[PDB]
Design a protein around this ligand. Structure first.
Ligand SMILES: CS(=O)(=O)Nc1ccc(Cl)cc1
Length: 212
């Protein structure tokens, strides 16, 4: 059937939708279709064509109220890629508190992690019951499921600037150094490559967590 209303969604609303590039972009909701128990959402993008999307691949174009966000909530967030910025999907790992300076910790679908503000987040419209189950990468999916279900039990390694450790990249262990700690994240310098990455302090990419 063709619908005009579904839950709190209305045809003609402005929305964010997931493109095939896996980045999210502004558009208009132009149709809502049912087939038995299933629902699809037709979006016309501003600088593009059209897609027919599942409800977990559209997001509201406003910032979620804080009382609506939990550990495990499915969100789109500001993602830094060199000097460019995109909107990319993730899971809320921490809500604002004193130890994190009142920020949200995000675990992105590709395995990166970052702290963001409320003004950098958007809520996915129709998340799955197990919110992690639409994460395509299997290693990322299983790690996030374990994290969200074990929370608040969160093993982490205690690290200090200048400490030498081994860190994983592309299947092998690399000599590295702790440059800085910011709440639950550590900035690691890969010593051969002379470039850095922010990594979650409970990540199994840190050799002391791999061991456990
Ligand atoms: C969720 S996170 O710690 O930022 N990244 C991550 C992703 C995948 C694995 Cl197997 C381990 C860690």
């Amino acid at each position: 059937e063709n619908l005009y209303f579904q839950g709190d969604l209305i045809v003609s609303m402005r929305i964010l939708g997931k493109k095939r590039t896996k980045t999210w972009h502004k558009g208009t909701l132009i149709a809502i279709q049912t087939v038995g128990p299933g629902k699809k959402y037709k979006v016309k993008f501003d600088n593009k064509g059209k897609s027919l999307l599942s409800g977990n691949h559209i997001a509201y174009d406003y910032h979620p109220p804080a009382d609506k966000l939990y550990v495990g909530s499915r969100v789109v967030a500001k993602y830094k890629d060199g000097n460019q910025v995109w909107l990319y999907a993730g899971i809320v790992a921490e809500t604002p508190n004193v130890k994190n300076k009142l920020r949200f910790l995000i675990f992105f679908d590709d395995g990166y992690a970052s702290y963001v503000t409320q003004s950098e987040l958007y809520p996915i419209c129709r998340p799955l019951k197990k919110t992690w189950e639409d994460i395509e990468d299997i290693s990322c999916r299983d790690f996030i499921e374990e994290y969200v279900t074990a929370y608040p039990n969160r093993p982490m390694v205690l690290l200090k600037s200048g400490q030498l450790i081994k860190t994983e990249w592309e299947g092998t262990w690399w000599k590295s150094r702790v440059e800085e700690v910011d709440g639950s994240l550590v900035r690691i310098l890969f010593l051969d490559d002379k470039r850095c990455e922010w990594i979650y302090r409970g990540s199994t990419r840190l050799e002391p967590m791999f061991s456990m």
